[PDB]
Structure formats: C-alpha cells, structure tokens
Amino acid sequence: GQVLVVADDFTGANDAGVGLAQHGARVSVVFDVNTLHADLLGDAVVINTDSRAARDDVASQRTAAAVAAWQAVGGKGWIIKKIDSTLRGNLGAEVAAALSAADVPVALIAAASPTLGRVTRQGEVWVNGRRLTDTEFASDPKTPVTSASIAARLAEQTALPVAEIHLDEVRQANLAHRLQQLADEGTRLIILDTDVQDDLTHIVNAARALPFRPLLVGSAGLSDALATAQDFTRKTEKPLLAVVGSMSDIAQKQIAAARLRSDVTLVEIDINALFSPDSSTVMASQCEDALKALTNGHHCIIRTCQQLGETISHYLGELTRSIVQALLPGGLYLSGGDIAIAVATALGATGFQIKGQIASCVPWGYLLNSIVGMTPVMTKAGGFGNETTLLDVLRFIEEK
16 A cells, blocks of 8 residues: 655656645655654655766665665555656666565556656657657756667666567557566566556556556656555545535536545535424534544535525524534635625624635635634635636645
8 A cells, every 4th residue: 555656866756746645645755764664654655866867886776775675664565666757867777776676577667757748659758749869858968868768778777678568559458468478478677658648547557457566667657647546545634614505506516526526525405304393403413424524534515405595594504503513624615605694603703804815716714703713714606616616725725
C-alpha cells in the first residue's frame, strides 16, 4: 500500500508529491534518508537524490541508499524511480541501482507525460512533434541529451538487457503475459511506448497483474497513473457541512458532481415526511447521519427532495442547530438565501462578516455571535454558479 518515489531533482520530487497528494495520499519529501522511520511511510515518501549532474557512481549509490533506507524501516508497496521526461541525467546508473535494490526481475520504463507533450514512439521520446534530439532540451548547458532512444541513453551507463514494447503491443489485453515472458527470458529493463494517459493506466494495470511488483520508472505521467491505481481513501479532518434547500436544476447538478466523490455523503430530507408526528425521531436520525459522515472525514451534504418553503427553512435551521450542538464541521455552506438566513438565525448569529467570494458566486466569511464561532460560512443564491461550484467550495475547505 505504500509508495517510495526516488527522484533526481527538486522538481521531479515535488511533481511526484503533488500528484500523490492530489490523489488522496499522505505524502512527504524527506530531506535526508537518515530521518526516515516507519511512521513516515504511510502513504508515500519522496526522496530527492539531487544527482542529475552528479558522477554516475554517486548517483547510483544515492539511489540504492534511498531504496535500502525505505526497506530498512518496513517499506513495502511500489517503488517509482522518477526520471526527466526529456531524458537528462544519470538514467542508466540510477535505474540499475534502483532495480538492484528493489531486487525484482524487471523495471518497467514508461517515460511519457502526454499531457505535457512528451510521448514515446518506437522506443524514442518525441516532444511536441519532433524527436528529442531535434529540440532545445538536447542543447546543454549541464546535461546534453545525445539520443531520443531510451535504450541508447540507458546503454551509456548500464548493460542490463533491455526490450522495447511498441504502441500496438502495449495496447493488447495480454500485456502482463508479455511482461512476464520477458522477465522469464532474462530481460531486465522493459521500455514501453505511450501516446495518451490511457496507455499509462493500462501499463500500470499490467504491472499490478504480475506475481511481483516491478520497479516503475517514469516521469509525471507514470507517477499520476500509479497514484490513481492506489485508490487512496480521501479523508478530510474538518469537512464541509452543506445545507441545500434549493430545488433548482443547477443545484442538483452541483450536488451530483460532489456526489460522484468517495468522500462525500448525502443526507436526504424528504419534504413529505415533515408533517408526520415521527418528524422529531426522523430529525434525530438525520442528525446522527450527519455526525457519522463528518466524524469519519466525509463532507456531508444535506438536501431536500409560500409556507412550504418556510416550514422547510425552519426545519433545516433546526436540524443544523441540532448537528452543531451534538458535535467540526470545517465549514458551513448554505443555499439558497432563505436557508442561509434561517440557519444563521437558528445558530444565534446577528450578522455575517463577508471576507470574500468563492467561484465567482459564493460569498464566504464568518457569522457574528453564533454558536459556530469562527467556522467559515459560505452562502449561495439559488440558480447561481455552474456544475463545479460545490466542488470549488469543497476544495476551499480542504485547503482552509
């Protein structure tokens, strides 16, 4: 379940860390492997060997040492050796060291970052329409690149046997069988074409179907694909409590988009069940439902499905007050205007100090004199925004 990233510079290390963090991981860059310990392993560790311009033997020793340090404290899961997408650096020395340390039959080298314009075709890196050696990245002034061929570049520093798998063969359903075959034959480095991100997904899927964990070697593209495949559980410490009484079409869209997420829980309030005498019992249950969501790190969205609107606004005001007294949350989002004022009033607020706005239509700030203290509060008028407005509020609370 754990990931080790070994990068040869600052930017590679950051890009890896950011990708893992965006996909739910607890991730840190550790400056000296001698501060590595077991509690730092979950979910990902990133080490910068700062070896892009170093001697090949130093680059190799540092890469090997990073892997061994992670293993020594109980690291087990996936190791990715991050390389320059434009093939600068001590590629062969570092890949060989990482593979030796990993002690598995093969490394999968899938270097492409398609969304950044780097692809691999017949074993060679192309950048925006040209082979790598036909671009500026091959023009020094620290690490000149003398070949677009990944094999040729590796061969400058390691004689490990290699094999290329070009794009049509990559895309076959039986890729994992082909990888195993190459491993069985004594191939050590397998270099894979890639044109789009789906190719890297497929490659990681094949990697995961092997009876061992191969070393992974790539740039941002492979790192992103690995991060996705880990399926990290998204958990925010102080999540949003959202109370939505708008029946408008755009609110359904906004909520649906949030609903797609695995860290979002809906509590649905039936309007019809508001007039039965068990309404109190049912409210207590909705309240309990909200608590469980928030205490387990899920954003919680409460939503409904003349005097009607008023009975509804009062009830949600009452439920929200109930939830606050039972408790978190990291923020409170209220929509539309009727809900906002009913809920704020129910929380004893005398006003709303506005600090700014989110997503061009969600005022945010703090309620004054209310039982939620300095909890950020957000509002939105009915009908406003687009499909991702609630997603934008979620991100705001997560970053808090």
